[model samples]
Target: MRLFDVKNEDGDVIGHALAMEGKVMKPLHVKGTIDHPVLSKLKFTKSSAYDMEFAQLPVNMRSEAFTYTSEHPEGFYNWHHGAVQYSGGRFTIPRGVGGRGDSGRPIMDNSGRVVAIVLGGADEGTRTALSVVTWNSKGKTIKTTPEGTEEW
Candidate 1:
């Protein structure tokens, strides 16, 4: 497995993933598995008001800064959004309009409904990094089923 590398300003290494991608840019429909043969092809969106194409997201938006590192036996993937580097507890700007996290903010899907988003996570120092977002049934937002099954 190829581990994603995290570099510092001095070109020094701070940490490395033992396994699994450090962060994921995609949403989690399964419990743990990142790859879902069926849902994997689904293009996620921030909101219906915004574009549905994944390419529209800015650099920071593509950065899986919100995804957490862990083992998801049930194919669960969390929707992490907030990020903070260790040392001084500095808040890092993630993708989307919300800086880090808007304090327990709900991440909506393409249909103006929330699928799931990150709440928070623990850091290497155990200081608790606000990383890791998810779209599980527990936190799914109710969306209006459009007529003709139109997502618009």
Candidate 2:
């Protein structure tokens, strides 16, 4: 079992992917939940500050974070580095900071996976709308950018 270091056509060691050595684990009690093996990994959440008393965020939010940046086009780099504030408690995308060239374009990951759609930049007033970049979810994945966006 070998994992190739992800790179471009130039052949550079950009990043590493985990490869399972062999077969994966299976559940013995398919229906039983009272007792089961405890596996600890990571998951995404809307807010890093969950309902929990306290929570510490993992620095590496995942490659999804990277997708946010790669999706930008030639001249959209400036607005890509802003904040995305929550709107009406729901996600709202703002426009103005700049970079509308690819308004409806797809924000892809390093592996070319579309994570989020590019939104507008920050503006004035409670211009929280333009204050952050926002994307909608088509399925279950929360699209984010590498500049700083994540599942949280």
Candidate 3:
């Protein structure tokens, strides 16, 4: 099994089976055990407990710098928009927008809809992405139903 490579300026690595490919950027689903078969794809989004797709999410967003570098990772929930009225993707999150270890969070648009998810930047903020998905951390594909709290 290959791991998600978390390399520094030097070298390191990280991912589970839900991995991406080179020529193609596809997400691989997990390899289920023989314990089941029908709808056996329920192994993803799993921790010791559970992590289903966020039904409340406007729709979308994680990152590296957001991890191993957050000072106030606890205040994300209490965060507010104030009067910013801001939203976009593939852009940098300068200071005060968000902080380190704040990656993979969502950025909503004018109608309170999600346009992108943060790709945790330095201690100051994070970049953004249109979306993210789950599957086998090391596998080779990510397929799911779009219209349900339960994807398979």
Candidate 4:
């Protein structure tokens, strides 16, 4: 599995993502939880305040936290830097002191982890929706395509 720390143009860690095979598994919020074998490595909350925590990391460290296919297998950057169009099922970062754009921002856990990414709101779409993180700890599979909208 691989993890990516999504950021904004100003270089704040809006949120984080976990991917496997070639699919963007899920977007976690600052206070969210995930059940994985790597549970020991997971930080359920932010370490400190958002900007104050990652404010000093160098540009190299801030921009790319993990390696990913710039041209993802699906043909688009799963999570691009800055504003994004909500095609559904992906996570985003949160609104910081610098603020976020009309597109929903990432929701960070108390520990400052990006546990959820919101889509839509004032600009496009109708309402804000949380990106789905589909990892069943016991079953261990990514539900890329939900059986139905209701199931999602």
Candidate 5:
């Protein structure tokens, strides 16, 4: 009833995980459809637009209007603040409006919703990848399926 595994396509357990309190439904990742009973609470799309927010409070740096074009191959059409265009999965933001030693954050809509993740690393770990939101509020389950594929 609580907790799940992070698995590969072959259903092999490549990682570990843990969780609780099903009603709030704080699903970090899962194997199912967007229309799943629990997932329906949130909204996600591959659509590209310029209506979002990128926040890193340690940088507490507030930025906005991140242009995202999800249709771009190689993940193009990501214009971070400071007029810097980003294509690779990772890009930086202005901590003081001009930018980051930090990477990987969330570009969410002003109403508090994520569009796409700024994939990168925070100076550690074996890989790079890519949020912000209310303080201790109810959380929702979400997913970012790979291009041309679904149900990761």
Candidate 6:
């Protein structure tokens, strides 16, 4: 698998997201397995409002960062979101407003509801350690779903 770092025009390693491309097997996660047939496609990564600068986060936000990565190792932690979950796949989380650092932030879905929030890498294969973001149960997010129609 090949991993690409997400950067800006200035050539800065923004670390907002990462991209993975190549042949990958199924069974993306241990708890939330791939619920649908494998689809051939490329996976992209994008971070929430916080981006990659963890040290620049506010004390409260920085402290809560542990809530997502405390248990998982270096790779991405697949947390349950809304009524769907995935072992691994491409997803998008909302970006916070300027007050939140212009970084990505979680927001309620069009249904006026919020769901899951994940922190870690983008792809489950080689790029697991290169990205971090939150995937709410809202908006244009997909690639994998939970096993059942259960709320996360």
Worst 10 residues of 1 by lDDT: 143-152
lDDT of 3 at 24: 10
By lDDT, the best candidate is 4
Score candidate 5 by TM-score against the native: 0.20
Residue-wise C-alpha lDDT for candidate 4, range 30-129, written one tens digit per residue: 3222233343243333222211111122333344333222121111122334433334454323233112322223333333333333322221134223
Taken over the whole model, the C-alpha lDDT of each candidate is 0.28, 0.27, 0.24, 0.31, 0.28, 0.25
Q: Of the pair 5 and 6, which is ahead by lDDT?
A: 5
Ranking by lDDT: 4, 1, 5, 2, 6, 3
Top candidate by TM-score: 3
How would you encode candidate 3's per-residue C-alpha lDDT over 1-152 as one tens digit per residue? 11122222333221112111211111222122212121123333333122212111111112111111111111121113232223331233333554332332333333333333332233313422112332333532222122212111
Q: How close is candidate 6 to the true structure, as a TM-score?
A: 0.19
lDDT of 6 by residue, 1-152 (tens): 11122234554432221111121221122112112122223342322233221112223333323221112212222222322222334333222201111112222233322232222323233312212233333533222322321111
- Compared with the true structure, what per-residue lDDT tens digits does model 1 show for residues 101-144? 12233333333232333333333233333333332345333232
Summarize candidate 5's per-residue lDDT along 17-63 as a digit string, tens digits: 21112121222333322222333333433212211211121211113
The candidate, 3 or 6, that scores higher on TM-score is 3
RMSD of 3: 16.2
Question: How does each model score on TM-score?
Answer: 0.20, 0.22, 0.26, 0.23, 0.20, 0.19
Better of 4 and 5 by TM-score: 4
Stretches off by above 4 angstroms in model 3 are 1-42, 45-90, 122-152
Clashing pairs in 5: 57-60, 94-99, 95-99, 106-131, 119-129, 119-130, 120-129
